[PDB]
Every structure is written in C-alpha cells, then in structure tokens.
Design a protein around this nucleic acid. Structure first.
Lengths: 117, 133, 88, 120, 50
RNA sequence: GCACGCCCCGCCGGCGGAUGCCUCGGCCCGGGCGGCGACGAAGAGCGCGGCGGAGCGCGAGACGCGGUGCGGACCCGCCCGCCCCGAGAAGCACCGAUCCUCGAACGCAGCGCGCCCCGGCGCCGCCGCCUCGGCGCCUGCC
RNA sequence: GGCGGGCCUGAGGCGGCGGGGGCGACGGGCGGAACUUAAGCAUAUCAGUACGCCCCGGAGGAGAAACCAACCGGGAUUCCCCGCUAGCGGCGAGCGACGCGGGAGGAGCCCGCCCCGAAGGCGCGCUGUGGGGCCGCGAGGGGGCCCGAGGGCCCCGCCCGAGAGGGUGCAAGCCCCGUACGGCGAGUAGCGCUGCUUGAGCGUGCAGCGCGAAGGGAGGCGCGGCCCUUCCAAGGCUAAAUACGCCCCGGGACCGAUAGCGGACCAAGUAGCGCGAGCGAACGGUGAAAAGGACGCCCUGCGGCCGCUCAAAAGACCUGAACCCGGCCGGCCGCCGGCCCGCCGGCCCCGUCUCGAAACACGGACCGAGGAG
RNA sequence: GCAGAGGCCCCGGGGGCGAAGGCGGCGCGCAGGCCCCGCCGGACCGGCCUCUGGUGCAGAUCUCGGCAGCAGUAGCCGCUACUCCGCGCCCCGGAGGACUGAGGGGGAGACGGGUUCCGCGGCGCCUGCAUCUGGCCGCGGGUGACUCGGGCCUAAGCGGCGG
C-alpha cells in the first residue's frame, strides 16, 4: 500500500508539475478545552479571512487556497492568524502564465508535502 | 542477478516453460555453437540448429561429425547421420542416437536465404550493442 | 415385499433429459428440471451446495464469446470504444 | 496446393458461384470414392474441403464489402456491419455527453480558469 | 423402446458410436501407455440416461 | 521317530508397496485487471480429423477459413505436403468472417405443426407516427 | 335523435431504441433462523449471522450539515490509528458506540420555489420547454586423468553493469538458453397507540394506523416556561483515498503424492453411485538414448532355454522395507540371568477405567504409512 | 531425535574413487539414540552455532493400503436327464431316451434396457467346472410405411389470460 500511494502521488505531481499537491489549508484552534492551546490545519479559509486579504473564493482556489464557507472564525484573533497565513502564501506563490513559458516551468520546483506546515 | 520482476526465477515455473514451450522458443533453446572459423566469418556466437547443418559433437560419447538428418523439437534433441546405437542384428536398419545440440559445434551451416537474412539482422543488432548501445 | 419385489415393479421413467442442462433431472409429470430449473428463466443456484454450483457455471464450458472479447479488451476493443464515444 | 485466395479475390461473383458448385460436386465424388474403395490417403479430399471454405470466405467477403458500401453514412445500418463495441460500451454515455455541464457551471469554469502556479 | 423418440434416439446413438477403443495408431502417435478408454460402456451393466 | 509346526545359523526366490530421492501440481501472500449478453451470453446437446475413441479446439465454410505483421524448416505413427534471397513447415500477435439444435430464447410446440407474401411472424416499455373508440369536455349543423 | 372539428381520456398497427439472463468474491436492498452461550430455560446470547429473494458497478454504498460541540471551538463523505468505555443486559451470560487527537485523501454543486414566458431539445411544450505497451542484441574454457556420459577431480586461465535461474549423458559464470547493460420542499415534520430494532437509557432509527402543523430542528433524563449556541429536514448529483473472487503475473523460513485443492496421471467434478436433489474415487516415476529385447536350441505346440541391447535389467518397469510365504541349509525352540548353550532359577496380557485387573470388565488378527494442547 | 531457515565448515564441508534410502554385523552411550563396516542402491547429503514448527505413536468398535491363519475348508442340493457315435468341447450333426405340457422352459407385442440383433474371426477377460460355446471379445454390416402406430382430437388433469 505504501508503494502504491507514493506511485499515485508521483503520477499526480507530474500532471500539475509546477503546482503543489496539497492546497493551502487554515491554522485552526484544535477543539475542546483539552487542546484549546494548540493549532492544527482546517478544511478551508473562511470568506471573511479571504475578504481581509482581498481574494474572492474562486480566485483564491485558482491560487491554491481551499475555501470553506461553512467555517466561522468565532474570534477576531482567529481571523488575524489566517489572514497572515494567506498573506504569506500570496508572497510565496508565483503564477506561471504567459501561454507556455517552458524555461521558467523547467526550474519551477513543485512544493512537496503540506504547504506552510 | 535479475532486477526485472517479469522473468520468473522459480525452478517450477522455469521447468514448465522449457518442458512445454512454443516451437519458436524450442528453436532458440536448441541453438548450437558456431565454430571459430564460422564465427569469424559471420560475427554471431551461436546460430539455431537446422536440418542441413554439419556439426561436430565435443563432449558426449560419440564425438564425431555428421549432417543433422532429423530435428525432434519435442524430445529437445537432434539426430546426426552416422551416430547411432549399435544395431544388434547386422542386417538391420540403424536407429539414430539423439544428441543434444548443446553438445555440438556447427562446422557448416545450411545457407538457405532466410538463414542469410537472419544472420544479417543479428549482425546489425550486435553492431548497435557493440557501439555500446 | 418391501424391497426386491417392490423394486421389480419399476418400469417407468420419472426423470427425463433437460432442454437447458441436458441432465436426467427433468421430471416428466411436473415438467420442471431438478438441476437446470427449466422452465424457469432464472437458473437454479443455491449457496447451500458449493459443489453443485461448481459442477455447472461459467468456466465449465467453452466460454467462447467471453474469452474472445476479454482477449480483445487486452488489444484493440478499447480503441474501438474510444472512437464510438467521440463522434462514432 | 489449394486455390490461393489471392486468385479468388481476383474473380467475378458468378465465376466464384460456378467454382463453388464444381468443388462441391468434387466433394461428393471424393466422398463416394472413399466409401466405395476398400484407401489412397485421399489427400485431395482434405485439400478440397479447405478450398470450399476458401472460396466461400471470398464470396462472403465480396458480399459484405458490397452490402457495407450500400449501407454507409445512413442512420440505422444492418446490425452485422455495426461497430463491434460491447453491450456496455454501446450503452455508455458519449464522452461529450459525460462532459456536458450546466450553463451556469460552464460560466464559472470560464470565469475562473485553471492557473499554473508554484510556491516556496 | 421400439416406440422411441428421434431426440432420445439421437443421444443414444452418439453413445453407441462413442463406445469405441483407442485407435492403435493414436496409441502409437501419442505414446499413450494407457490404452483403455475408461469411458467405454456395456449394455449389461451401464445404465445410460440414469 | 519322520512328517507337521515353530525358531531362524545362514542362503536365495515370490507377495506387497513402505522408505528415500525426485516433480510441468497444489496451497499461501502480494500485485494487476475488472473486460458477458436479443449484434443472442453463461451453459447444454449433436456434429466436425485421410486414417479418430476420450479430452482440447471448432461449427455443414467444423481438429478450421480469409487478411496483416512476424517467424523461417518442419509436420510425435503411417502418410503426403512442404523444401529453392521466397517458394514458405512448426510457431506467434492481431483483425475480418462463418457460427447446426437448445438455452434470457423470440410464430406455436419440442422435435411435431401453422401463418404469411416473401420480408418475415415473441413479450415488456419509451418516443414519434398511422387507423380509430367514447351519451368525457364542448363546438358546428339539421 | 342523427351528423363534421377541437380538446381530454383510451384502444389496435408500424418504425426507431432499450429491458430480460450469466459470474462460489466485494457492494446495496429486503425477508430471516436455529444449533450455541447462559453450566437449566423463556428476556437475552448466538446474530442485525447461515440461508432465501432482489438489484448494480468496476468498485458499490456514503457525501457537501434541519452536523458536532460547549472551546483562547471546529466544519461534506469514505478508509486507517486510537478512544475502550459512556452506556445497555433474568444489570445475569454477555453486549457496546461516538466525540475529540494523529493520518490517507480531498471538490464542490444543482433543481423546485421565484423572475422572464417559447427566446427552447420546436409532431414536444404555456397544467412551463429554455435562460436567470512492444521489439530486441547479449560476454567469456582449455589441457590432463578417468567415467556409460562430467557439469567430477588435477593443473593452469578468461568474462562479470551478466556468479538470478533453467536445460544439457554426473555437481557448468565461460556448452545452450537466459540474466546485467537497451531501443521505439405537507398527508410531510411531529404527536397518540402498537410492532420491529438499537449501546441509546420516560425511545436509537424504522414502520402501520389515527391525527396533523408553521418559521422549524438539535444540544445524549422526561414535562411546562425563559434564554443561549448551532443548523435548515420532508427534492437531486458528485471524483479521490477503501473493499474484492474468477482470471493472469510474480514471490514464498509453505506441502511433497494416505501429503498439498476433491482432482500433479493427454481424457477429475472424470469413472462410478443414488428415481432425483445430490454424491464422488482410484491412479506420479523404464532408461542418458527405446537402444523396449540379436541369435541359436528345442518344444505337437504353448512357452521354456540360453543369451542379446544397456553402465545396470532398470524388461513394464527408480529404491523395493514390514507383514506373509516357497526352496535349500541349520536347530527345538517366549523373555530375563548364569554359564558353552540346553540345563537350573525367576517370570499372568498389555493398554485402560478402577478401592482393587491375569480377570468370566472393556479395546486389541497382523504389518506398514497417517493420527491428538 | 525429526523437517525446514540464517551462518560456519583456513585454499574453502561430504558425494559416480558411489549421496540419500534398504538389509545384516560391530563399536560407543544409563538411555533416548549415535557411529562405523560389508552388501544392495544410484544422486544428493550433512556436523556444530543461532532460528522456526503441521516435530517422535502398540491401542482410539482409529483412518487408508496390504495381507495371514482358518482352508484346498464351507460350499457350487431349485426348474425329472442324459446316452452312444462322428474328429467331438457342455458347441455341432445323426441315432436313442426324456422334459417344459397351449394360465407353456411356445410364438408375439406395450414398457424398460440401447445395439444386446446379424455375419465372419477369436478366446486375453467373462461364461461362478469346462468350453472349440456364448448374450463375451475384434471386425464388417442391420430398423425402408399414403393405408400400422405416433402426429390428430379430447378424458382425468395441466397450463394460459386484461388482471
């Protein structure tokens, strides 16, 4: 099974060679008073957080940010956490368009693993 | 060693494949060493055995040279004219002693035309290999 | 007269050959096959007997068409499929 | 030793129909002879049987070729000439139909196209 | 039985033509070593269609 | 006592298939595929080989046929048929056909009987189409 | 009352297209046991199992909250790791989830309603169409002695990006093949009563019948108020990660022919058996090469005899044990001990239950293989 | 002690200058057991160290296969029956003497078996003694319909039907 998942992962990576396999996901307080101190990765950035950066949900998905309308920040501090995560990703991301630009694409380097862990 | 998984290294699978193989594969399995003189002329180490070939046995008892009168691929053996079991009765028809073709060196080949075409195909393929692939 | 004499009064053919399964299982009086199930459209398969299912099923015959079409799927049947999906 | 199909390919259907009848009368003759005689290995018998098949393959191939040409580019074509496919492939939605999407959905795909991107 | 059915007669007929010994030349060609058919039946003991 | 029957100081021989040795088979665990059918499946029956029983394989074009690309001397008996820079044995991959009777099984039976103008003739839907029925809703008439 | 048309329901016929049946698995729906455990037996347990029926598909189902939670909160589904215990149960025997947390994998949407009103897929439709894998080449070994035949030995060498293997007259990197190296949202929610079910407990989900809303649902102890958090049922789709047989491919600290599949045998679900459903065997090995037996002698003939082939008869077959038996030879004899060896002395038949067996207790003709913490 | 696995066996363990296996005979060990010799046999097999297990059989009315003594034993006691001669077998031919005794040990059909029927050759099996016999074995053949029967029609019954 381990070899199979890597082989499926390698095949998928090549299909979107410049793009990272994992989409950007949000830092989220782990639930319960047991883990309320720590933070983990959530399904998607809230519409308010994307609005704070200035990205619409559809435009954000193209950049690579997963969007969850369901999530509500529940705080003003939670929004700040994610808006800063979104801001950093926007700097790290480079949009390769210009029809075909093979030389830039060859050295693109696909990010591997979870983005901004 | 073998780095390819497709080929089987099992004694059971290997023996069944040899014991029951298609005639095209029986042919290559029944190849024999081209002589030093022939090798220099044709640049092929071993060519498959034919029914006009004259061959010199080099190991088994009965080490003489004769034309290959018959090839029985089912028995995986070839019969060479003049190498037979001792006919008990003097006035009796000879029974050939089959020799394996590995035990033989091909002194002469039946040239044919397909044999010549086959010899050439290998000569150009071996040249690609000799060109270090 | 429970055994020998009673067996001696037998001269009848309760069972007969089946149309669908060619076995001496077709009752002549009831018009049904003990093994084939004919005249039922569906065939008689009961998971109480693993052996009975194995005695007659796929692979117990020529498998003519299926073999020929399975071989084609490892060849050019799949290319023919792609052409049909796209235009014809 | 049997009539090469290359030669029958190069014939007329009427000549092929005549040839088949002659082979069939010969096939009767060989059958009469083998039964009457009490054997010669009957080598022609075996060859003739293959040459009744060879001639009839040619006659089918000509007929299929003539019929297929008549039934061409027409909705509703004789089933025998229909693409082999398989029962399920015949019944599967065309890739254009499978890809068919609602107008609102298509509008969004155009609005936000796939972008190539890379991250540090 | 003298009032038989063609379909029954046809299946009984195959059995009569099939109950035959291995041709000697077949034994020689394949080198059989088992020259007995074992699918050969006898009207006294075997009950076909039973 | 001899014979017998025992036991064996040993010597041979039957009878049986143990024990070893092997082994184209199983089992076990991974892969990989997921590909049947009214264009008739799965299955079944009957036939089919020059000599032909079983099994395999085919289907009256039958132990196979056509095309293509390889392959290049054989074909387990007896054959006769090939043999030759192509002439074409065994083999192989595909592709095009043929494909009897039954069988979801389809004119009706199951092996016998119809219809019909010559193509055929089963059911159940869906969608058009054609011919119509209704003191359903009316309208036009007399 | 007769007669023409339009509509609305219906018939008969023709076309075009589809459905049906099959696969010992996986997957969905339904019907549904009992043996068993409780050291009895009803509730329970077995078991939402066998089995019956019915549908798919390469996966299927599930799926974008009428969600969980109670926080410095998460956020569709599926699978995995953990939670193993909250609970349930003649609170007995037993049974038994989820929520966090770590992962694999991730993708979102659409209709009705409403706005337009044929702009449409235009014989329809305004009782609403339409829009919003193959193909290849492929290295390098001689001499000596012996053997039936080296692949054995004894000396010397050569190729390894190949010393994985298989074959060949014995144990072969260099004899043959190969291998390593390549190429080309309403009869609804709810509620009353019943029944099934669930860990779900004054109800976990379902269902019948009765009655039936409007802003409603939930928050794991019912009821009536008051809030607070959270969501929007009664319409629909959706990939992925997961499962799995036939079949094919490869591997094994697997079994080695009374074993391993029932089945290693050219003809096994076969031969046979049972009216039938169904049941169900036995059977591997000559040799390197069939070289599968030259000849002569006789015999009324059969057949025998020699010998032959082969390294060997290995002669219908590898080895050929035990039991059992026939010849010939040798003794008078169960065991244990002493001794020259047939005399003295001692010896009940084992296993097993049993207080106690030589028991007139039971099992045991004999031998081989298999046979149980 | 068994059967596999990982190692070792100081020029790389033992083997056609004879492996495993079998049969007799020593030797060592309290014994489980081991070793060697001779003979057969004809290609594989170990000792130690670490590992594994489907690992040791006198029994289970044990399973399966072989087979002994009883034992040349019990028995081959239905249907009255054979005899002589031919070359003569129980087959055949002649001649005698019987028997089934027209509800037949006769001649035929329905069913059921499925070629057993027939002719020619043979005995390897089978014919429970024999066989030159045969329903046995090999080979080659054999079932002809306007009128007879099926088909046909209905009977008990059984299916089929908008549903």
């Amino acid at each position: 099974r381990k070899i199979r998942r890597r082989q499926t992962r390698l095949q998928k990576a090549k299909a979107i060679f410049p793009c990272p396999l994992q989409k950007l996901r949000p830092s989220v307080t782990r639930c319960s008073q047991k883990f309320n101190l720590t933070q983990r990765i959530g399904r998607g950035f809230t519409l308010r957080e994307l609005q704070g950066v200035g990205l619409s949900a559809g435009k954000a998905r193209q950049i690579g940010i997963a969007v969850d309308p369901r999530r509500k920040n529940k705080s003003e501090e939670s929004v700040a956490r994610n808006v800063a995560r979104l801001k950093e990703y926007l700097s790290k991301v480079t949009i390769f368009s210009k029809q075909a630009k093979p030389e830039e694409i060859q050295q693109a380097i696909q990010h591997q693993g979870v983005v901004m862990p | 060693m073998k780095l390819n998984s497709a080929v089987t290294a099992s004694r059971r699978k290997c023996r069944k494949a040899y014991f029951t193989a298609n005639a095209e594969t029986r042919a290559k399995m029944m190849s024999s060493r081209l002589s030093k003189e022939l090798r220099a002329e044709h640049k092929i180490k071993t060519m498959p055995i034919r029914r006009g070939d004259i061959v010199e046995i080099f190991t088994g008892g009965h080490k003489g040279t004769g034309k290959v009168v018959e090839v029985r691929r089912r028995d995986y053996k070839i019969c060479v004219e003049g190498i037979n079991q001792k006919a008990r009765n003097p006035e009796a028809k000879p029974v050939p002693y089959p020799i394996h073709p590995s035990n033989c060196i091909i002194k002469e080949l039946y040239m044919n035309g397909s044999r010549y075409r086959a010899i050439k195909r290998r000569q150009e393929r071996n040249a690609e290999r000799l060109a270090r692939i | 007269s429970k055994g020998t004499a009673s067996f001696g009064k037998r001269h009848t053919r309760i069972h007969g050959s089946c149309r669908r399964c060619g076995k001496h299982s077709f009752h002549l009086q009831k018009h049904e096959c003990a093994s084939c199930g004919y005249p039922s459209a569906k065939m008689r398969r009961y998971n109480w007997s693993y052996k009975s299912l194995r005695r007659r099923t796929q692979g117990t015959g020529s498998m003519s068409h299926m073999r020929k079409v399975y071989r084609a799927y490892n060849s050019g049947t799949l290319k023919a499929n792609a052409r049909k999906y796209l235009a014809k | 030793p049997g009539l090469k199909a290359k030669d029958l390919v190069g014939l007329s259907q009427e000549d092929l129909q005549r040839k088949l009848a002659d082979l069939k009368r010969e096939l009767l003759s060989l059958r009469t002879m083998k039964a009457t005689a009490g054997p010669e290995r009957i080598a022609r018998f075996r060859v003739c049987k293959k040459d009744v098949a060879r001639v009839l393959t040619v006659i089918n191939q000509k007929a299929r070729d003539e019929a297929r040409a008549a039934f061409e580019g027409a909705e509703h074509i004789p089933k025998t000439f229909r693409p082999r496919l398989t029962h399920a492939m015949r019944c599967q939605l065309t890739e254009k139909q499978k890809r068919l999407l609602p107008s609102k959905l298509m509008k969004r795909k155009l609005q936000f196209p796939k972008l190539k991107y890379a991250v540090k | 039985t003298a009032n038989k059915t063609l379909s029954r007669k046809l299946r009984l007929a195959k059995k009569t033509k099939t109950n035959k010994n291995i041709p000697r030349w077949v034994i020689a060609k394949d080198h059989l070593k088992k020259t007995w058919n074992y699918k050969r039946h006898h009207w006294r003991r075997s009950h076909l269609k039973l």
